[PDB]
């Protein structure tokens, strides 16, 4: 067709108003007389706009259709599909540096409530400036806001600060993991490792491979006391040599604190537990004391015995101390 | 079909089927933009499609709208290796899609972005495997390049300051929780008194949660039914509030009808007292106790506890 | 140059309308009534194939940068946004969303030489936690990833409406509901000995660091610590000049160190249990050797230009010790 500019106007007699333009170079501008990208939409959208009409470009879908989706496609080993968010202060003609606390980009989800959409969004992942930007500083952070049930406004729940510190329910996390609440791990039940003349038995919630692939992990939880004993090799000597830390399963239980370690060829674990009710027994099986029991033990998977066994443990039944290596 | 040519390159096309192509003579979606944007492009002109806003306007926003119980609004990111004509499977470690934020600093934008959420391939993809991971990058104050701070790996393991998290929660630093003050649960002839930072309902709704912090020692005693048996029946772990304090370790549990807690504390100074109230020892104190909200007494009570004050052990059930 | 004008709407038909430039200045593709500067509504059926399952799509190749979609804003008030709108029913008649229904999603698709992964390879989704009304608009954020050797993204993390974050948990009851292990850095072995020969300490942290990381707990596995202060700190008590002489062994033990302060300097509460530890008096004679456990409160003392033990107590085998 044309050999240069191609502009579209509306109500020209009433008031000169350009709408779209196909430049000679091949760029398309909607609301902009000078597009800077293949397709630049600039028609002014005032604050008066109502949801879901508060945007420049919009795809739409319905029922089982898949048209209400926006995409970026790249077939390259070097580049990547991107959703770029550019932010600056001042104005487009004269862009100025962003200030500290200035929001840069946001991914907001709006939901209809039969009447309208939620002002401010129902859930937002935002990028915010952590400091006034300069040619020497471009600090930024990421925040995650969601709306509590029965509420109508998204609140900041998590933050990945410029320093890398993650804060849950914390605005300025000073810790690498600053939590404003409780920490919950899985309930791994009760542990058992008995090695006696009668045989070898063990109840371990993990497997040799798992522990070997999870070195340095701590697990804390609440459950009945453990039953531990090795009157033959691992727990063979010491002041109290063949003792059995015979825990009684109770509703009160106690807190297990187990961290993973290794022998260099097999999985090992450091276990700690305190609670009710525990009875200390000797190799013969006679009860020495019964009641509150506390214990620290170091168990490891022994392939020679095809099961887990205690290498050394020490603790206290009531006011009596026992050590067993 | 309707083509829009310039002098003699075709720029736009409205096909008979109703698809629109900008830079593509064969669009595959309602509106496909393909005009070549070379690497030479500078910010903020490095993109195929771009919305723009100004001041108080809301035009600089890109949206996807869906009215359906089945489908959902999506921002789809497709990535492949090779070329468009001959696309091939992605490689291990290859980036798939990214959500990047650029910020002007009065002269330019930060090359690489100031903060980005990226999706990366964890393995060479095939018909048998499509593993992927999510990374979160941010720029530190005084820096000019976004660095990977967090990662949700293909296995679900979250890594904070860790590239290959082997733990379900692999943190490369300290873990901090709220300071819950000092706890007290005394049941005496003088009365029933207790200072608990939580409420029965709260503990019942937070089972299995661990809380650690530093504060002055606790004051615990039950000299009537629970603790008044065993080696040291009436016993008071009379902790003195000191600057050094000690580390509390409290995990939530239950009786089946009310909240219970397992408490641990060590530090200085502590005074062991008997039911009569005479001091048996003073100094370093350690204790493990199991308290629980007893409605019959309308307050928290100690079910059973045992510890060591200085080098003397004490027990109470 | 060149241009064309119209007094009002301008429709394009290929039969039947495919595009339209309204009098107000809006452009609609597949919609006879656009509501934004550029509104695309051409119906895309479920039959569509990847990567053609979308209304609008940018494309890039090799070293080019056109496969990017962007939002630009130059304002102190507004910010670049990627708005995702979701409603029930239909576009003409939108209705409130249901509980648990997904609202918006950012999914990444990857080619496997034959096709793209149905459902996406990794997705950040926003989901409704309750039926919406004028009184409630509860929502949550989910993070889905695909395991190596798998072909479907699974929900790995969730930031619920209540702020509770879950790793491998659907309904996090804890602000940090983890369905697995928690691992921290291995800070080695700690040492703080103050004797007639002098004062020495092996601390993996700095006074400044500890002062700037108050209330943080660190747990790990390593050999036992070597602690003693026979001069000022642990100079009194039942066991006055004790040295908790740990022997470095493969079995080691679990350290539990939490940060505190004196009000002017960094302090720490340390706990350690394990094998093999030797109890020694100020003179240096071994009282016992074997299983050792200890609790200690150390702090950086500037008078000594190093870390020292203020008070410590524990047990070696069955014999108990305390010092302050």
Residue numbers in the entry:
A (entry chain A): 827 to 1151
B (entry chain B): 831 to 837, 842 to 1151
C (entry chain C): 823 to 837, 843 to 1151
Give verbatim excerpts from the published study on this entry.
Bdellovibrio bacteriovorus is a bacterium that preys upon a wide range of other Gram-negative bacteria, entering their periplasm and consuming them from within. Proteomic and structural analyses of vesicle contents reveal several fibre-like proteins, which we name the mosaic adhesive trimer (MAT) superfamily, and show localization on the predator surface before prey encounter. Structural studies reveal a variety of domain usages (and therefore binding capabilities) at the fibre C-termini, placing these on intertwined trimeric β-prisms. Using independent but complementary approaches, we identified and characterized a MAT superfamily of trimeric fibre proteins with diverse adhesive tips, able to fulfil the long-sought-after role of multiplicity of molecular recognition and handling of diverse epitopes (across a wide prey range), by the bacterial predator B. bacteriovorus.
To address the potential for domain-based diversification, we crystallized the tip of Bd1334 (which shares 75% identity with Bd2133 in the fibre region but then diversifies), from S818 and S914 onwards, diffracting to 2.6 Å and 1.4 Å resolution, respectively. The structure is composed of three subdomains: a partial β-helix (D823–A868), a full β-helix (T869–Q1011) and a flat β-rich tip (P1012–W1151). The tip of Bd1334 has no similarity to that of Bd2133, forming a β-sandwich of a completely different, square-like shape. Tip trimers are mediated by edge-to-edge contacts, burying 6,900 Å2 per monomer. A composite pocket is formed from two chains, making a tryptophan cage with W1078 and W1102 from one monomer and the terminal W1151 from the opposing monomer. W1102 has an unusual cis peptide bond often enriched in binding sites. There are no structural homologues for Bd1334 in the PDB, and sequence homologues are limited, with sequence conservation patterns being non-informative. Thus, the Bd1334 data show that MAT tips can be swapped out in evolution and that Bd1334 is probably specific for binding an epitope encountered and bound only by B. bacteriovorus bacteria.
